[PDB]
């Protein structure tokens, strides 16, 4: 409760590689490379798990956007129609 942080985006996990993963935004068609350090929020993410992050273009690197303090959102808050890709493999 020190600084005010507004403007958070939600997305579904597209990958959880051993060490990292991806978060497909509902509005954007690109993943958001994240680290297994912001998930400290408390929640074992999983394939297709809604999450909330502030994200920022940074100040020093004046570039790249990373998701900080990753908090898994409950079922109900997020929701959006998505397509499926039926094809073994």
In a domain, 1, yes or no: no
Sheet of 71-72: strand order equals: 22-25, 9-15, 51-53, 71-72
In a domain, 87, yes or no: no
- C-alpha torsion angle, residues 44, 50, 46, 42 (rounded to 10): -10
In a domain, 84, yes or no: no
- Range of the structural domain that residue 71 is part of: 7-79
Count of the separate structural domains present in the chain? 1
In a domain, 2, yes or no: no
Contact 31, 63 (CB under 8 A): no
In a domain, 11, yes or no: yes
Q: What CATH number is attached to the domain comprising 54?
A: 2.40.50.140
In a domain, 46, yes or no: yes
């Amino acid at each position: 409760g020190s600084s005010g942080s507004s403007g958070r985006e939600m997305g579904v996990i597209a990958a959880m590689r051993d060490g990292f993963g991806f978060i497909k935004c509902v509005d954007r068609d690109v993943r958001m490379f994240f680290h297994f350090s912001e998930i400290l929020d408390g929640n074992q993410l999983h394939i297709a798990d809604e999450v909330e992050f502030t994200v920022v273009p940074d100040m020093l690197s004046a570039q790249r956007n990373h998701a900080i303090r990753i908090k898994k959102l409950p079922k109900g808050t997020v929701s959006f129609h998505s397509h499926s890709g039926p094809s073994s493999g």
